[PDB]
Design a protein around this ligand. Structure first.
Ligand SMILES: Nc1ncnc2c1ncn2[C@@H]1O[C@H](COP(=O)(O)OP(=O)(O)O)[C@@H](O)[C@H]1O
Ligand SMILES: Nc1ncnc2c1ncn2[C@@H]1O[C@H](COP(=O)(O)OP(=O)(O)O)[C@@H](O)[C@H]1O
Lengths: 557, 569
């Protein structure tokens, strides 16, 4: 709960002043209805035209004053929101350069676009719109209620008769189906999933059909049956709950309660006039408080998400390409091991390979060496230095990596190859590109090496992968962490990517996330993992002679 | 509005008439109730308040008639809401299976998912929550304006002409308010797009030791843009302030007009006060509509989604191994052409491989043959019969496909396989399971083929899912089988299952396979090499390799690609 209020800590003073101005503006907006009551009292008293003129000028000036304040609040509140949002975007920018690099491959969490674009926009609506709208929605009924009680406390109480009947019928309607209100969000979530499945499995339903076609239809009918059975019995409650709050019902209660008072001399007829003006729509004002407070809740959830991102842990710094893993264990979630008691020594110049079934934790152990996450227990050392003690400039100058889903920065090809070292000349870049088997397609482009790249490009998966392999080659990292899935990501470009990786892997320590065991026969050290635990370690022929789990995997190939 | 009328079923076209006439009756009763304040209040403020009893008697009689018509319109509102819910959802669920597969783009799929899932509780309460308040508030200022004509013609003209001005203010306020939201959303999206790029390329930047220069560059760009954009602010009145100002000015204008008449002697003081109250009853509905601006905006959006789905284009419509003929076939996903004059004839009873570089148009051919899509130009024929002219049942039974994605659904593994032909006997399932090499998977599962393979069931690997999908296609008795290869990298048994499906099936039918590796096309009778949406090379395996063409080079690359080892050649 405190996460939302902690983000908006510096906006305590602007938001308080904004709420005070909106309270002031709403009262100024209700002032004309007070002046009409004074106008009627002037007319009944036979006041001279001079007093009628001053009252008319007072009303016109308040309308002008309210318009000016609402315009002045909007401009000032926009400037406050524009300065805070710029501060926040600067903070999000600095946090994205300090979060652990595995945070961008999360599971079961909001995307970066939602946290940066949508949530920052929800905060802007919160500061500029939802809070002033909520303050007006709460102050208008309270100001009206106090004025109508000052005018007369007897006809003010009978305004609550329709209100109590609404709350009583709302309470009866709520307890009577309290289970179903809790089920209804889960029915919506289920149907969102089933609608996605129906849209996803469309081709099967076209050519095969059968049980698949009627599965979604029958479950759709169940949902519609749930809605109809849930809401149909509450027609009587909901209709009667709506007529009591209508202005026509309030007008009758006001007049049937005021006319007996006025006719019998128990009321001054000008004291009924405030109720006729403002008190008729009093029921619809109380129902607007809920929508006013809904805006605060929606914005505060967004403030909840943004502060949660800003509260994440970061990469702390402590204190021939050899790599030492020593008693390493790792938890993605607390108390859920994924790596347990793994020990390895990637000797300099040797190609070490990780092998195992899906979910064995092989991919995580490569992510740990590049420091996508910090090991919860144990240590990983590179050239005798624990990777925790290394800065990002020091670590990634020693431990490069080419993992799956490679990325291209906005810029020309020359920068993309020379991203690691922009000072490299075009001769050095060209040799690196030819080393990665991409120089052919680069010349095939119309602009040559000046071809622009970015979030969207015509290059296929294999082509941009070889561009990234060209970047890694020119990075010159003695240690390398490689994912074998980069090879068969583009089967039609498989051989070219293999040649690039073959050129990349030479006189460099290598870690391989192996998926096809036939590509592994000449690796210097095989590692077999299942459920996060190293099972066997040794060369290809030696482990086959042992005949352990590795030979079972090979027979399973 | 035309889309909402289209949702009405033929059953409730009568009840909508009852709803409409009772809504007008409700608006007339409220207008008569508001104008009855003219004599009621004019007598209440007079020398003798006791003359107010008669007009309170008429007011309460109008009020009770108001409640009777209001509950009837609410009852018809709930009935129409449920009927509209069942009608639209069922008509929307029946529409989509007939929709051409080109329509299901990611954005179009998003609207279709929204229209199906998120419109449940909304459509049930559309007419009661939105239309009844909206119509009552819209017609009541004009109803009061017309009714005041019978009290005073210039008065009714002035109050009726003020309806046009005040609705004009609502329209202008809506335009300014929505334009402001458009600008607020777009400027924020302009600020933050650089941050999304910074977060996207973080692995590239961090690994390349350029994260801090890139962070400073983005920080400088944000600072300059905000410094330029902050000074452009100017003191603008928002949309809501414009309308509320228009309401107050109308209030003071009418009150000033009433007082001016009183000073001129054209009205009495009690009647002037009564007109002040009635001309607050007249302004009040305009504020009621302004509260429905958010609800009306969302409802307009969802009705646009439902209109989009219900307006989706539908495919037209009318056991030996058929021949598949392509004649001048051109097909495009909008403007993106994928096939350019492709033409070939698959010999009946033979297996034809389809191969080519990544991209190309390989998968589009099988989707055209199976009837998932219809060609933009040219024709696809089965034994000289156009696929589009086939009857729906004939087209369903014509073709069997193994898709790139298995598309397994929630259910038992045997149920996942029985959808090919539920009339098949258990031995047919066993044979199709054997050829698909799923019997090896049944040895792993606890309950065998009865095991659930859904999202909440069992987590099958990629190869196992494909072998279930191959079991679907082999079980079906369709005279055509299509294959679109996709396997897990390790599962060689999946390739063995595909080989058995091509070869070990005794059923006589034409076979087509889009292939990626040599293990399957080696058994094929002929190959079509497709590049850039055209068949750049065509021939048999022996014919193509003897020619030493593009397919031979592809054959050499893949054979080499099946033999490498890291740390060696
Ligand atoms: N996107 C993700 N975010 C966080 N944790 C994940 C994610 N994907 C998988 N995991 C966890 O990490 C482990 C990775 O499994 P692993 O065997 O290394 O992958 P692969 O099957 O590709 O080799 C899984 O067992 C799972 O518990
Ligand atoms: N849903 C879609 N919307 C638009 N274009 C598509 C869609 N699906 C595929 N395409 C187009 O089809 C082309 C790929 O052809 P395809 O037959 O799928 O070959 P492959 O099987 O190698 O992917 C791409 O260039 C792509 O633009």
């Amino acid at each position: 709960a405190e996460a939302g209020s902690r983000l908006l800590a510096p906006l305590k003073k602007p938001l308080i002043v904004s709420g005070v101005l909106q309270a002031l503006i709403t009262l100024i907006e209700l002032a004309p209805f007070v002046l009409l009551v004074e106008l009627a009292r002037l007319l009944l008293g036979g006041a001279e035209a001079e007093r009628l003129w001053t009252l008319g000028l007072t009303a016109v000036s308040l309308i002008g004053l309210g318009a000016v304040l609402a315009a002045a609040m909007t401009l000032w509140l926009a400037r406050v929101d524009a300065r805070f949002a710029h501060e926040l975007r600067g903070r999000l920018l600095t946090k994205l350069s300090r979060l652990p690099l595995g945070w961008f491959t999360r599971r079961g969490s909001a995307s970066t676009k939602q946290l940066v674009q949508d949530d920052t926009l929800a905060l802007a609506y919160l500061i500029t719109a939802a809070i002033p709208d909520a303050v007006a929605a709460v102050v208008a009924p309270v100001a009206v209620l106090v004025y109508l009680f000052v005018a007369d406390w007897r006809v003010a109480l009978v305004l609550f008769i329709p209100v109590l009947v609404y709350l009583v019928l709302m309470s009866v309607m709520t307890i009577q189906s309290g289970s179903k209100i809790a089920q209804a969000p889960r029915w919506a979530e289920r149907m969102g999933g089933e609608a996605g499945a129906f849209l996803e499995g469309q081709p099967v339903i076209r050519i095969f059909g059968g049980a698949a076609a009627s599965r979604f239809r029958r479950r759709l009918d169940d949902y519609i049956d749930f809605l109809v059975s849930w809401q149909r019995p509450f027609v009587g409650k909901k209709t009667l709950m709506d007529l009591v709050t209508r202005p026509a019902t309030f007008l009758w209660i006001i007049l049937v309660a005021g006319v007996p008072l006025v006719v019998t001399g128990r009321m001054d007829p000008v004291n009924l006039l405030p109720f006729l003006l403002l008190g008729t729509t009093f029921g619809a004002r109380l129902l607007g408080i809920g929508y006013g407070l809904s805006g605060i809740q929606t914005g505060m959830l967004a403030a909840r998400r943004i502060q949660t991102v800003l509260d994440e842990p970061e990469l702390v710094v402590r204190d021939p390409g050899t790599v030492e893993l020593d008693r390493v264990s790792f938890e993605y979630r607390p108390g859920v091991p994924v790596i347990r008691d793994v020990t390895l020594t990637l000797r300099p110049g040797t190609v070490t390979a990780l092998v195992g079934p899906s979910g064995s934790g092989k991919s995580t152990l490569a992510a740990l060496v590049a420091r996508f996450h910090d090991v919860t227990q144990g240590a990983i050392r590179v050239d005798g230095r624990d990777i925790r003690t290394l800065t990002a400039d020091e670590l990634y100058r020693r431990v490069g990596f080419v993992l799956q889903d490679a990325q291209l920065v906005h810029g020309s090809v020359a920068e993309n190859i020379a991203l690691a070292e922009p000072d490299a000349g075009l001769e050095r870049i060209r040799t690196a590109a030819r080393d990665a088997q991409i120089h052919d397609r680069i010349t095939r482009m119309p602009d040559g090496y000046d071809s622009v790249l970015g979030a969207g490009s015509a290059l296929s998966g294999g082509e941009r992968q070889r561009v990234t392999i060209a970047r890694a080659i020119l990075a010159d990292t003695p240690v390398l962490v490689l994912d074998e899935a980069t090879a068969f990501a583009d089967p039609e470009s498989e051989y070219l990517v293999q040649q690039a990786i073959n050129r990349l892997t030479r006189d460099r320590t290598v870690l391989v996330i192996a998926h096809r065991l036939h590509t592994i026969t000449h690796a210097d050290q095989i590692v077999v993992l299942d459920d996060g635990r190293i099972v066997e370690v040794g060369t290809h022929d030696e482990l086959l002679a042992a005949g352990g789990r590795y030979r079972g995997l090979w027979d399973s190939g | 509005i035309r889309t909402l009328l289209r949702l009405v079923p033929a059953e409730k076209r009568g009840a909508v008439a009852g709803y409409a006439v009772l809504t007008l009756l409700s608006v007339l009763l409220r207008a008569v109730g508001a104008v009855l304040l003219i004599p009621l209040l004019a007598a209440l403020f007079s020398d003798t308040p006791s003359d107010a009893w008669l007009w309170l008697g008429w007011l309460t009689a109008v009020t009770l008639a108001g409640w009777v018509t209001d509950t009837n319109t609410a009852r018809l509102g709930f009935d129409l809401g449920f009927a509209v819910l069942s009608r639209t959802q069922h008509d929307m669920a029946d529409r989509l299976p007939n929709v051409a597969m080109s329509w299901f783009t990611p954005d179009n799929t998003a609207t279709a998912r929204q229209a199906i899932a998120a419109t449940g509780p909304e459509l049930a309460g559309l007419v009661v929550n939105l239309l009844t308040p909206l119509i009552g508030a819209a017609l009541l200022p004009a109803a009061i304006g017309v009714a005041l004509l019978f009290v005073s013609v210039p008065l009714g003209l002035a109050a009726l002409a003020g309806v046009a001005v005040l609705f004009g203010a609502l329209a202008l306020s809506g335009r300014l308010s929505r334009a402001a939201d458009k600008v607020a959303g777009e400027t924020n999206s302009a600020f933050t797009e650089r941050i999304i790029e910074f977060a996207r390329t973080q692995q590239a930047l961090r690994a390349a030791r350029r994260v801090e220069p890139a962070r400073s560059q983005v920080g400088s760009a944000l600072a300059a843009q905000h410094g330029a954009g902050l000074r452009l602010l100017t003191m603008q009145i928002p949309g809501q302030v414009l309308f509320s100002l228009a309401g107050q000015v109308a209030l003071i204008g009418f009150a000033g007009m009433a007082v001016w008449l009183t000073v001129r002697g054209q009205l009495g003081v009690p009647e002037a006060i009564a007109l002040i109250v009635v001309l607050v009853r007249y302004l009040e509905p305009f504020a009621a509509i302004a509260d429905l601006a958010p609800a009306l905006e969302t409802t307009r959006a969802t009705l646009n989604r439902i209109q989009a789905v219900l307006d989706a284009p539908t495919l037209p419509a009318g056991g030996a191994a058929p021949s598949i003929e392509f004649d001048d076939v051109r097909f495009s996903y909008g403007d993106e052409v994928v096939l350019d004059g492709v033409s070939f004839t698959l010999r009946p009873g033979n297996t034809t491989a389809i191969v080519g570089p990544s991209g190309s148009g390989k998968t589009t051919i099988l989707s055209l043959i199976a009837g998932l899509q219809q060609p933009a130009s040219g024709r696809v024929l089965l034994d000289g019969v156009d696929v589009t002219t086939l009857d729906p049942e004939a087209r369903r039974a014509a073709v069997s496909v193994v898709f790139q994605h298995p598309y397994l659904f929630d259910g038992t593994l045997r149920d996942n396989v029985l959808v090919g032909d539920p009339e098949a006997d258990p031995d047919d399932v066993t044979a199709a399971m054997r050829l698909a090499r799923v019997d090896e998977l049944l040895d792993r599962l606890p309950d065998g083929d009865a095991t659930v393979v859904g999202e909440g069931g069992t987590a099958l690997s990629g190869g196992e899912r494909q072998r279930v999908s191959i079991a679907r296609a082999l079980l079906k008795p369709a005279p055509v089988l299509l294959v679109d290869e996709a396997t897990s990298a390790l599962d060689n048994a999946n390739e063995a299952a595909v080989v058995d499906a091509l070869t070990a099936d005794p059923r006589p039918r034409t076979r087509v396979i889009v292939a990626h590796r040599l293990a399957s096309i080696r058994h094929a009778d002929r190959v079509l090499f497709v590049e850039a949406g055209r068949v750049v090379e065509d021939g048999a395996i022996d014919e193509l390799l003897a020619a030493g063409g593009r397919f031979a080079q592809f054959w050499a690359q893949q054979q080499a690609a099946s033999e490498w080892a890291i740390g060696s050649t």
